[PDB]
Amino acid sequence: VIKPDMKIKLRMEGAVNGHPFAIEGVGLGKPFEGKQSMDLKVKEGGPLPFAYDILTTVFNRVFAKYPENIVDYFKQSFPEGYSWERSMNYEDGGICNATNDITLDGDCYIYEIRFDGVNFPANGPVMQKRTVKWEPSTEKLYVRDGVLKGDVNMALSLEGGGHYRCDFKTTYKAKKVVQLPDYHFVDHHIEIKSHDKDYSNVNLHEHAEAHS
Ligand code: NI
Ligand code: NI
């Protein structure tokens, strides 16, 4: 059911500091190589008044290269698919909640995404768009109450130098019973490869690899 080459379509609806927006996307990847990319377009609420970077990790752990010796919760959950929930706690009190419900239609994954950011300070790097990129990261994955958790210490590099820290807590939920993994890691590296001036168009890449 998992094919070597796969597509993606998605819609995100969200709000940051009570201002709504909508984004759509199409993309493609290689699930077994842990690579994907996508083009994203802002449909409503542009030009976004906040750092696009806060959204990019929300725009699928099926696109992660799992070796044979680690159970792959995500590829097993297909064709029924899985959903996830995430809280993203920024060091200045900015908090983002996100969810993604992932279904499969033919060779295409479909994402229905909600994003909700509150309490970003007007003079902070998100609302003044002073972020450069996310550093590559290592997510720690562990089972709890029959579902899979993933935690990660993330950092955004900042235009004047330095970093801005965010802690991610994700819960991933297969829509059917699957085998559960042991403790393991996923290395991630997410990059905006191109974009237009106000980020109404963005081309986003990620490569991920599981290890134990
Ligand atoms: Ni890389
Ligand atoms: Ni740029």
CA 16, chain centre distance (Å):
16
Burial track 168-190 (b if 16+ CB lie within 10 A, e otherwise)? bebbbebeeebeebeebbbbbeb
Ligand nearest to the CA of 190: 1
Residue of 96, 90, 164, 155 lying closest to 130 (CA atoms): 164
Q: Ligand 1 centre and the CA of 157: distance in Å?
A: 15
Inter-residue contact 161 to 176 (CB < 8 Å): no
Tell whether residue 19 is among the known ligand binding residues.
Answer: no
* Closest by CA position to 53, among listed 128, 109, 149: 128
Stated resolution in angstroms: 1.9
Q: Which two tokens stand for residue 47?
A: 């030009």
| 205 among annotated binding-site residues | yes
Six-digit token pair at 8?
Answer: 């993606």
Residues 6 or more apart whose Cβ sits within 8 Å of residue 104? 1, 78, 79, 81, 110
| Three-class DSSP category at 107 | coil
Nearest to 119 by CA among 45, 44, 54: 54
Q: How many CB atoms lie within 10 A of CB 107?
A: 10
Beta bridge partners of 154: 166
163 is known to lie in a ligand binding site: no
Question: What are the structure tokens assigned to 143, written together?
Answer: 């089972």
Q: What is the C-alpha separation between 89 and 119, in angstroms, rounded?
A: 10
Q: List the domains of the chain with CATH numbers.
A: 1-212 (2.40.155.10)
Ligand 2 centroid to residue 133 C-alpha, Å: 10
